[PDB]
């Protein structure tokens, strides 16, 4: 007789979705949610090219190592890149105070332009060109010091007097600027830089009050020098006022940014090529349409969300029973 | 299968069938088929498309983890910072995994009760003017057109106009 | 709808039935009207009840977010703050969200299912006794009263007192 | 022809809308809504308690005596504070006030404060305890005054200034939240003439804290024509310790200190009234008087409050599916 | 119950059977007994036992708190690992829980499923070769030994063979 | 009168009920509990390694040599380490150890510890070093003495302090944790007396490191009958670093230090009174051992080791077989 009858699709397919009852099930139809494939490279994110510190530090490219020089100047950054292996940071020994915090702070820019905030004719009575040292060799001077700090010595004849020295914001972006202590190995050392007798190094603004004065002590040599130096930074905000005022031992700010304010810091060896991308992880480039990502969690751009899975199938289709065919 | 038409007491899907997910497969003497009932594989389509589009809304944010470095004496936060992203990853791995899980459990039920209701429909059209041979299949008791299999397709299958010829043969045999 | 009974062969509700969700409409010489499950009806409404506060209990509980302040230098721990609130922002506004998408679509069905429940049963009282059409009614084989209607409905429906009368009639 | 008996379901004029993962604007005959949108902008009573409004003050300005600030200046028990934002009255001789953040965290999970005289200005001996005034910190009454829980303490017209000494042993149960300073004057002249010469130094210890600080002279800019400096510190005696503190200069003496008593603190900035309705539910945008789950107002808030998450909309279907003829 | 089989219109269950979860009780007259369908209750046995294993294995990470202690010039980030540790214990809690009610309320629904549909499939076999009594249970218009159940348990019930004699003994009836 | 065939399903004796989203308290024949409420009120060792017990020391006192923390004087290995509530011997002549949260979780971190010493006290030439004892310090067998892993330093008979210096290079692969300080009387009197006059200071630097402290000489509250204060102080020695000690006065140097084994552990600290017994546990919560296969735990959110996840719930049984629904007997 006339038959009718009811049923359902079938296809050639062979992926499988699993299931909270049931493991490796074929369906004739579904969808992978999961990008699990990377390109390997930098690129440019809203057609702005990222920073590459290349042999320098993020420490040796804001005070101005000498060997450093590739990057001085105004930059304008989507990214930043430092390559794990940078030999050029700080040369002379010492301690960049809240360095973490000025890492974070720098990540947090897109731009910097470069400008002499305190010209060195505005300290009376010093030496301003004398003072450079073996540590900081550039790749043509045997002694050289930061670009942006001026090394401050006494005079042919002592003695060292009270300097002083004032900035006025003035314009609309905060300006990041650095200082330093030196910290001679003896007493003869700072007879000869300095003057005898208590020196100090004072600083302040309407918010903000620095003072500090030299620990004299041989420390371990490190770059041929048993001598330290204090590194410090501060950001002068839009209509601030720095004071700077000290009798001996102040590494003094030469230049400054004008610092232009979510950022990144990539530190990474991929090579940064000529191309766009609108989601960049530290570990490669992203090109998906897709809403989950296994490459990574460290990301800027629009990515999609990042989860620890292998795949995410997501069955659209009904089971497939293809009839069977010998 | 949860309502157990597919893989069920309806054994098998028709490679022949390729316009839709569910359907009917006729024989007449004018010549056999499959064809697929385009209502229900819409409204499957349009179902199955809204929830993929609403799971896709849904997982449109991101959690973002950060470069921060931390010193020495910053060991404490710097493991706060740790746990923290470790936290919300997991937290949304798991989400993620379970409602794929979860999803396709009922993704897979949903067809399954749109071919059992697609073969109630038929069966209750029917009633003794054809006997229930196995897996989903009826054999008509009267001749039917080209023009009934569409009129027990489309719903309006006409009942009494065959009892009389298909009780005649019911019973005949 | 999924199990086929709401928007489906079943085509529409009843403006008319005010008493319950799921009921009956009955037709004879001595009239027509509406009348609710009152079992079934009650049933569901004990089962979403439980439903809805099950999940205001389990969504009771808030995260604290604080506004503490932080200064000029405690950026990373100021953003760690942020983010970690914003992450569990993020994930209750999903938690929510996904909840209701999926709770309405359970509770849909759950009420297409009462429904298509409610017909089998009626179906299996009456056996040959009536014609089943497609819509969820049925034509009884024979001349029933208020009170054989109301055995339907109560579930006390005599079959075998009505088996003759519609065997003739179904002959007719 | 046939009696008829149909199965059936309810339908009614609603046209409230829910979105299940399979079908969106689905019209449902009986609907609840979970998510709260509505407030009343104004800030209440809790536990039929009052907040503290700061009004023209700043944290700062209140705890640490702030001349005019006097209105604030006895014995206090709030629910939570107002500190408006635009609040012009703080710390009046520029300086820096130390631990700020860590010292408002503190504030905020308090309840109450009462005032005392920790220290007597006789404390001091073989110095001035009364010239201790500026021009900067002027009360509305008088052009030149002082915090009024501190002390500048000043050399005798007679010079010197020699070592002073003080110590209070807190007997109480209650912590005690004091403060003090150290000036930095712009000069070595400044120097001279209010304290002596020679090495000055400002001490203080307890049984779990210890303090060491000297003047560091220099001129800062100008702030309330103010070329010197003070730094403020804040701390906590606790039941059972004693204060001790010595100096020969350059010390702002604590006069005044609190007795701190300690739930859920809140601290909220804003400029919304503050009226005489009672509540149960604060946000820092506003009242929410109301019985649901979920709200979409604000993250921050005092008292029992429903969750707060981002979407504009919780709606749970209780009803079927609603088709009507 | 949802699918209306369970303490629905199969009102109780039977302690008598013991060797599975869905079966049949029979009467004749070589004897009465239970027999479980083994079929279906062994896979409802592997869908619950993978149901099971993976809410174990997404459940199987752990957030970590730590034992810091914080100075009382931390009270701030104390706060902050305090608030972030709660936050995560309320997050899995919560979804610990939902997901317990979920997966208990669909595991209930499955078990009703296999009953109905164990039900349906000796209605279809049987047709008006049986009586339906209330509860489940089918009284046959015909003699019905043992080889006779065990056609209608392994769907290979035989209704050509006994349709003379049920339509016979239904007339005298 | 017929032949009856029927369906139906399985019912017993249990008693055990489950919640579902439309239901509560609903009876199934078959279920699984995935939380675990047990545990044991003990320390059990972790990794097969006891844990450390401090007993009656702290931490601090007992890697500073608190003369009578004597029992754990040495070399110490362990999987965490356990500190009892109300232990005595911590710090006992009266001042601050700083960033000491920050050296507790260090310490955590925190395998093992080979004690030796890093300056003899021939290191420091022209001061007298037999005299560093207080009665604040007691060993169980003497009323003054002093920490076993400094030394207090105090001027020779000629009432001159003269500079001394110390260095010590780590030619090791280990870290070395070190402590030293400085020492702030209560008078210019005692100043004077065990120091020599004039402005005095404790300068120390290493590749990475620098350290300038003077003393902060007042008058402070009595503890332990001391009125003047030390400031402890503590760091790490990396392998190939050098350490250059400096001072005029007021050092209480360093004596014997800790070559430290870092874990690959998580690292746990556990303030607690519960017994410590010769017992193995996988997991260890800070309340007691879980001894299970369960999903989820009531117990505790702090352990070391393999535990399941902290929850706060009371339970989740998870249903597995169906409504139970057994016949009524009576
Ligand atoms: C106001 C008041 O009563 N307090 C002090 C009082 O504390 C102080 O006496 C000190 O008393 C303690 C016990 O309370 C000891 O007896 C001190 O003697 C020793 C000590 O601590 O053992 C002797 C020890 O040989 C000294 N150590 C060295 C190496 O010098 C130490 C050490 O000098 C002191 O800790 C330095 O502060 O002291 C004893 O000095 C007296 C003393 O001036 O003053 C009272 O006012
Ligand atoms: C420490 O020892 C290493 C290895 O012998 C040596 O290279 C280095 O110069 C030494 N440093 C100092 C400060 O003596
Ligand atoms: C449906 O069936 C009726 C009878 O077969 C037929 O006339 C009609 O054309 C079919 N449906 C339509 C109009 O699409
Ligand atoms: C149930 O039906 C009977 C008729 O069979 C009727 O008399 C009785 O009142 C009904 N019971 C209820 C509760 O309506
Ligand atoms: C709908 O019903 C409510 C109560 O029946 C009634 O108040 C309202 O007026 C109705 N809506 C319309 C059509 O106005
Ligand atoms: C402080 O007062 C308490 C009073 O109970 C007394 O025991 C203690 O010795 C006093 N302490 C000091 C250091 O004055
Ligand atoms: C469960 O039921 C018992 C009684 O059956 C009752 O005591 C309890 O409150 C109910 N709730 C729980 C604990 O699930």
């Known amino acids: 007789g006339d038959k009718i009858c009811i049923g359902y699709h079938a296809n050639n397919s062979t992926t499988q979705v699993d299931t909270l009852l049931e493991k490796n099930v074929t369906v004739t139809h579904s969808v992978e949610l999961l990008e699990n494939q990377k390109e390997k490279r930098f690129c440019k994110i809203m057609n702005k090219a990222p920073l590459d510190l290349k042999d320098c530090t993020i420490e040796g490219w804001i005070l101005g190592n000498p060997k450093c020089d590739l990057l001085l100047g105004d930059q304008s950054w989507s990214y930043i890149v430092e390559r794990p292996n940078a030999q050029n940071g700080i040369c002379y020994p010492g301690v960049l105070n809240e360095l973490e915090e000025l890492k974070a702070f720098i990540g947090s820019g897109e731009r910097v332009e470069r400008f002499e905030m305190f010209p060195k004719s505005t300290w009376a009575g010093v030496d301003t060109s004398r003072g450079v040292t073996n540590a900081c060799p550039s790749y043509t001077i045997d002694s050289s010091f930061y670009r942006n700090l001026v090394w401050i010595v006494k005079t042919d004849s002592a003695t060292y007097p009270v300097i002083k020295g004032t900035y006025n914001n003035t314009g609309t972006q905060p300006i990041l600027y650095f200082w330093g202590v030196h910290h001679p190995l003896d007493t003869t050392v700072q007879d000869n830089l300095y003057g005898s007798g208590d020196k100090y190094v004072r600083m302040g603004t309407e918010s903000m009050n620095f003072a500090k004065s030299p620990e004299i002590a041989a420390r371990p040599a490190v770059n041929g020098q048993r001598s330290r130096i204090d590194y410090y930074w501060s950001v002068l905000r839009p209509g601030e006022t720095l004071n700077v005022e000290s009798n001996g031992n102040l590494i003094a700010p030469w230049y400054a940014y004008k610092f232009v304010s979510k950022g990144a810091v990539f530190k990474s060896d991929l090579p940064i090529e000529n191309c766009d991308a609108t989601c960049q992880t530290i570990t490669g480039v992203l090109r998906t349409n897709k809403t989950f990502q296994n490459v990574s969690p460290l990301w800027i751009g629009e990515c999609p969300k990042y989860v620890k899975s292998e795949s995410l199938r997501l069955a659209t289709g009904l089971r497939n029973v293809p009839q069977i065919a010998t | ?173």
């Open chain 2, 1 to 173: 299968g949860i309502f157990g038409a597919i893989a069920g007491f309806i054994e098998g899907g028709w490679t022949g069938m390729i316009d839709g997910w569910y359907g009917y497969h006729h024989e007449n003497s004018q010549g056999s088929g499959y064809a697929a009932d385009r209502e229900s594989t819409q409204k499957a389509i349009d179902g199955i498309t809204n929830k993929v589009n609403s799971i896709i809304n849904k997982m449109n944010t991101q959690f973002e983890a950060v470069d921060h470095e931390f010193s020495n004496l910053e060991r404490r936060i710097g493991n706060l910072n740790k746990r923290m992203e470790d936290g919300f990853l997991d937290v949304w791995t798991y989400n993620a995994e379970l409602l794929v899980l979860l999803e396709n459990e009922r993704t897979l039920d949903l067809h399954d009760a749109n071919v059992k209701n697609l073969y109630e429909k038929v069966k209750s059209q029917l009633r003794d003017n054809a006997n229930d041979l196995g897996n989903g299949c009826f054999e008509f008791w009267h001749k039917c057109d080209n023009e009934c299999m569409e009129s027990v397709k489309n719903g309006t299958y006409d009942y009494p106009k065959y009892q009389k010829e298909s009780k005649l043969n019911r019973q005949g045999i």
